[PDB]
Amino acid sequence: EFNILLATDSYKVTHYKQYPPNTSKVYSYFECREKKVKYEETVFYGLQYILNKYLKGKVVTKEKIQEAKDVYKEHFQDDVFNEKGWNYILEKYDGHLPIEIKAVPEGFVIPRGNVLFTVENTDPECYWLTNWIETILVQSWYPITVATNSREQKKILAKYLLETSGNLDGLEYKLHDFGYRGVSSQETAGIGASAHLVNFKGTDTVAGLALIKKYYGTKDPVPGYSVPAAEHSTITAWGKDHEKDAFEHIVTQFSSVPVSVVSDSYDIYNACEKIWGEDLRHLIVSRSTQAPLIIRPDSGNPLDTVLKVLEILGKKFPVTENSKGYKLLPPYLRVIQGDGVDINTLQEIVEGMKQKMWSIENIAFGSGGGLLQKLTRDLLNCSFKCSYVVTNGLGINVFKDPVADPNKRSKKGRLSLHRTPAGNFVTLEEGKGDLEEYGQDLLHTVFKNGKVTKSYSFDEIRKNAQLNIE
Amino acid sequence: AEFNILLATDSYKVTHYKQYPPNTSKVYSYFECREKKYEETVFYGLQYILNKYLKGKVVTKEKIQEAKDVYKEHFQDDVFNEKGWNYILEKYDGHLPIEIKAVPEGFVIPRGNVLFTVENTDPECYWLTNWIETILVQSWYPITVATNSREQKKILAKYLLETSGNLDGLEYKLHDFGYRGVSSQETAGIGASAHLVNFKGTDTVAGLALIKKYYGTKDPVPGYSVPAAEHSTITAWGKDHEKDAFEHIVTQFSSVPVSVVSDSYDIYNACEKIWGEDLRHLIVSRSTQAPLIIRPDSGNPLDTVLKVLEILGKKFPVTENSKGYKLLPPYLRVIQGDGVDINTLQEIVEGMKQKMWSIENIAFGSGGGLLQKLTRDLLNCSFKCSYVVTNGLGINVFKDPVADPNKRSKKGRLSLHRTPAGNFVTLEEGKGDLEEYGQDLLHTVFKNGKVTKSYSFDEIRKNAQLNI
Ligand SMILES: CCC(=O)N[C@@H](C)c1ccc(NC(=O)[C@H]2C[C@@H]2c2cccnc2)cc1
Ligand SMILES: CCC(=O)N[C@@H](C)c1ccc(NC(=O)[C@H]2C[C@@H]2c2cccnc2)cc1
Numbered sequence A: 001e002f003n004i005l006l007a008t009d010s011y012k013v014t015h016y017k018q019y020p021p022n023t024s025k026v027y028s029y030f031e032c033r034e035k036k037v038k039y040e041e042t043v044f045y046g047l048q049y050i051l052n053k054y055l056k057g058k059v060v061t062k063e064k065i066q067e068a069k070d071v072y073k074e075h076f077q078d079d080v081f082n083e084k085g086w087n088y089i090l091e092k093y094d095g096h097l098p099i100e101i102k103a104v105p106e107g108f109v110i111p112r113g114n115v116l117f118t119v120e121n122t123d124p125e126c127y128w129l130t131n132w133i134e135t136i137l138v139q140s141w142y143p144i145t146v147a148t149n150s151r152e153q154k155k156i157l158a159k160y161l162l163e164t165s166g167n168l169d170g171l172e173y174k175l176h177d178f179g180y181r182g183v184s185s186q187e188t189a190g191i192g193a194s195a196h197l198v199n200f201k202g203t204d205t206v207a208g209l210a211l212i213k214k215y216y217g218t219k220d221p222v223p224g225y226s227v228p229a230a231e232h233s234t235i236t237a238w239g240k241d242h243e244k245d246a247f248e249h250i251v252t253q254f255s256s257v258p259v260s261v262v263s264d265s266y267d268i269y270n271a272c273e274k275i276w277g278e279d280l281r282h283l284i285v286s287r288s289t290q291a292p293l294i295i296r297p298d299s300g301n302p303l304d305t306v307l308k309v310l311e312i313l314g315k316k317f318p319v320t321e322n323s324k325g326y327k328l329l330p331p332y333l334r335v336i337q338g339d340g341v342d343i344n345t346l347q348e349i350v351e352g353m354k355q356k357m358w359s360i361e362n363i364a365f366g367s368g369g370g371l372l373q374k375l376t377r378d379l380l381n382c383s384f385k386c387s388y389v390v391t392n393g394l395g396i397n398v399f400k401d402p403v404a405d406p407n408k409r410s411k412k413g414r415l416s417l418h419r420t421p422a423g424n425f426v427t428l429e430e431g432k433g434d435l436e437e438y439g440q441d442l443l444h445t446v447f448k449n450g451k452v453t454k455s456y457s458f459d460e461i462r463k464n465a466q467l468n469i470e
Numbered sequence B: 001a002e003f004n005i006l007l008a009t010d011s012y013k014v015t016h017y018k019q020y021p022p023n024t025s026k027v028y029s030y031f032e033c034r035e036k037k038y039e040e041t042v043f044y045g046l047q048y049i050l051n052k053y054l055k056g057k058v059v060t061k062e063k064i065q066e067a068k069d070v071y072k073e074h075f076q077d078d079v080f081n082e083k084g085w086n087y088i089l090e091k092y093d094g095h096l097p098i099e100i101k102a103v104p105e106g107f108v109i110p111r112g113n114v115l116f117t118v119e120n121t122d123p124e125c126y127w128l129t130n131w132i133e134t135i136l137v138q139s140w141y142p143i144t145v146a147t148n149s150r151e152q153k154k155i156l157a158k159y160l161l162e163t164s165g166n167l168d169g170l171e172y173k174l175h176d177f178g179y180r181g182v183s184s185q186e187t188a189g190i191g192a193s194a195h196l197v198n199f200k201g202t203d204t205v206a207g208l209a210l211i212k213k214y215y216g217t218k219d220p221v222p223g224y225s226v227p228a229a230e231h232s233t234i235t236a237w238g239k240d241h242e243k244d245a246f247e248h249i250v251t252q253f254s255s256v257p258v259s260v261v262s263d264s265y266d267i268y269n270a271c272e273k274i275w276g277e278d279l280r281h282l283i284v285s286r287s288t289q290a291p292l293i294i295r296p297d298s299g300n301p302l303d304t305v306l307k308v309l310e311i312l313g314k315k316f317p318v319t320e321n322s323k324g325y326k327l328l329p330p331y332l333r334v335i336q337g338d339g340v341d342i343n344t345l346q347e348i349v350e351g352m353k354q355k356m357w358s359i360e361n362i363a364f365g366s367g368g369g370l371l372q373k374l375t376r377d378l379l380n381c382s383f384k385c386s387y388v389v390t391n392g393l394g395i396n397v398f399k400d401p402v403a404d405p406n407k408r409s410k411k412g413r414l415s416l417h418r419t420p421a422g423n424f425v426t427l428e429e430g431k432g433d434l435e436e437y438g439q440d441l442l443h444t445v446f447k448n449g450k451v452t453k454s455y456s457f458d459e460i461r462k463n464a465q466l467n468i
Helices: A009-017 A049-057 A061-078 A084-091 A134-139 A143-163 A185-197 A207-215 A230-238 A238-254 A266-280 A300-315 A343-355 A456-464 B047-053 B061-076 B082-092 B135-138 B141-163 B184-195 B204-214 B231-234 B239-250 B267-278 B301-313 B341-356 B457-463
Strands: A024-030 A041-043 A099-103 A107-109 A115-121 A175-177 A259-262 A294-297 A334-336 A363-367 A382-390 A394-397 A414-418 A423-427 A444-448 B024-033 B040-043 B099-100 B108-110 B116-120 B174-176 B256-261 B292-295 B330-338 B360-365 B380-391 B393-396 B414-420 B424-428 B441-448
Touching: A024 A134, A041 A143, A049 A099, A049 A134, A049 A207, A049 B457, A061 A414, A061 B108, A061 B204, A061 B341, A084 B424, A107 A343, A107 B424, A134 A382, A134 A456, A134 B393, A143 A185, A143 A343, A143 A382, A175 A185, A185 B184, A207 B061, A238 A259, A238 A266, A238 A300, A259 B141, A300 A343, A300 B267, A343 A363, A382 B292, A382 B393, A456 B116, B024 B061, B040 B141, B047 B099, B047 B135, B047 B204, B047 B441, B061 B082, B082 B141, B099 B256, B108 B204, B116 B135, B135 B380, B141 B184, B141 B341, B184 B424, B231 B256, B239 B256, B239 B267, B267 B292, B267 B301, B301 B330, B341 B360
Parallel strands: A175 A363, A259 A294, A294 A334, A334 A363, B174 B360, B256 B292, B292 B330, B330 B360
Antiparallel strands: A024 A115, A024 A382, A041 A107, A099 A115, A099 A444, A382 A394, A414 A423, B024 B116, B024 B380, B040 B108, B099 B116, B099 B441, B380 B393, B414 B424
8 A cells, every 4th residue: 555655756855954954944846947849838637636635644553654764775785764754744744744835826827847746844853754745735736637638639629610511619629538548557557547527428448437437526427538439359259351341340339329430440432432331321321410420440551541531431421521621421330540649640630621621629639648648747847846944044046057058947935826916826935925916826825744635626627628710 | 535436537438338249248359469670578567557457446436536527527528437337346346347368578579469458247237348449458558668669679789799708797787867858756666667678777767666666586686887077066166166076076986887967168178188188197097897887967968978988098007808899997987868769779888889989888878769669659559449249140340441451450259379480479359269370378367357467577587588
């Protein structure tokens, strides 16, 4: 089981001995520092999961202190572990962290370079605890980056949907999470899935559903939805020469709901032209508007394959023209490109579809790796730094300012986020927020002395994270 | 609020029991790092998955009811295999009627070879094999971290041997800094443990517990670290008191090696004026097993390394080694942790060599590059069904997409063999049964809810060793 005393970077175990003597306060903040996709604004999401799962309640025990002591004595080949400091938290506070965390509400969309959350110790003895928990808190970069990058792809889809159709109907289902297998772990799967679900309602990553339910909650039955679908194994197990039968059995089994059938197993073109287009057409043209056949390619160049499929289908099914003058497949027939989809290639497919006058109403996208795995902490320059210290009754504004990288320069003093008269955000430095020139601080206390003092519903988060779209 | 395997799959897999050919009794599948840099792969991390997520009673009455309620709402239709999961509950007491045979953990295998196979042991559970594909495919991550980390050990070994004549302390030349740069607490432990198959330097503590609990070592810990400063422990002293911070830290860690981040304001000024003059006397006096390790952390990774080495060279006695390469005094080293990945580490060792600096003078730290900036596509980690039994007839199945031939999967029952030349080969269409040459290298690791074969972390370390 989890032990906070073993959930930090090794070197942090040694830091209590490095601060100026008589330091009573170490105050730190997190931001997405200002740097082909720009990501000028970020979705703040995921901290509440960290607060509940790892920082709330009795997190220090005598067994946990002892387990850490023996581990670090071997790991450092020396005694540097602060047994005294951890025992103090256990005796004085029943193992509850004397820490205060202030954060902007979850789901809020804030421009780059603004304070998102602050961390400070409430007990002078625990000056070292602020940066101990940097490691566990900085991991919030991941739900932040997934939610931000997913929202950016919703902007792309929203542009082209409206451009080629004049409406945003079913925008919530145009980007589907297929990333469960392509992530580093079961926990990353739940965190990442949940962050995509702030923007969309389509997910195959089940892990995300339980995480939202336990850490946020919803008034809705489920946070995300899926449809019956096929894989190479459920097609190929019939034998090459029985591909038609596989398709016939699958589409008949799921006739009252939409069904995705992967048709690239041997020859995507033959499957669309002959099998769906000739041989099984009678089962396809009969389907409900609420229950279409979603044809799925999974190989080759994403744009070219998508195009080639749409024309092959256009030449075997009645392709109507809309109010914007864009080619639209019949409702009982849809498409899903779930291969090689990331923010870049998604932009390319929808632009290439617009150029060949194909409506975005015809396709939905599936993304795995590019959605939940192909992201780093550099993408948004998610960083945690110390901005203020109190040593021997004196408070000072501290920061890093490396000569070779001015982008690595951090903020000074006590910070606050404010709403400007023009309706924007400004981060105030050096305690200037106390004057409330631009009203009250937008950061709220979300954690204080082992207690989660403010929680957000996933419904509030979704609303806060909405697209401007005007 | 605990782990439920019925909710641990891709949603569409919940529907596949209704899609396989009628009267299918067996579904046999395998894993490989498909062929296209990264010629061979370290097979690592399955033992973690089997023990944590697959062994024992993974099915309970409450778990079936949890999954049923969710999937009803998730699909807005009843497509859940209540009967099929209750069958595993009543018959096997929630144990998985699955058999998994894998190549030994740590084994270095070339691309496009069978690494592990999965099949159902009961005909009612034909659907079970690929339900657990999602959880098993996640083994891509420990495999890829272990493979990419071993690849950087190859680069480091080449240049350390070239500039010093030995491979001394190679296991300490690439240190894990990735704990904050990963996506979760669970990823940190899997990833940190995967780097520790090749190295012994880590700041990702989460990796030690995983090793102790799922693999084990003769030694008390598989990974080691030293005291080190951070910008907060420097900057807290004030901009004018960088020398006081430095002095205090090097004094606190006087008898052990200590890393001090020196770029807070001006890396070059901390090297020439502070370390090179004002505190020089506290550096020249240090023990060979307790040096000062200067840490640059901004600027161009190679230029900074060289400019720093150039400065320390003009303030500290630089000597020529057995290979004719510049070596700093034993009480002084450099750690380059910023912007280190496989490509940049190459550029830095490449660059240092041309400038006649021994790789003895430097250790590298890698965060995101080592544990995060990796994907399933790096080694093309894939799980596919190669064999089925329908109406008592065993048919060899595969996929061969016209658009991509590199996506073609293997057919029939597989087995892995070492040829007499010493290379490897995967036998398809049940050809293993001929016993042409050598025994199958895939050994049963899982059977009917039980982990049948295990490896210690020391065994895995042995297997994953470089040739030289
Ligand atoms: C919910 C409203 C709706 O009707 N949504 C539509 C748009 C929709 C269309 C297709 C799918 N599923 C697939 O394609 C799955 C086979 C592919 C897959 C999953 C996981 C991993 N790898 C591949 C899901 C939903
Ligand atoms: C074990 C034998 C030995 O002595 N190894 C040497 C090579 C060694 C040298 C330096 C360090 N640690 C550092 O520099 C840490 C400050 C940097 C850091 C850590 C975590 C996250 N971000 C940055 C660790 C080990």
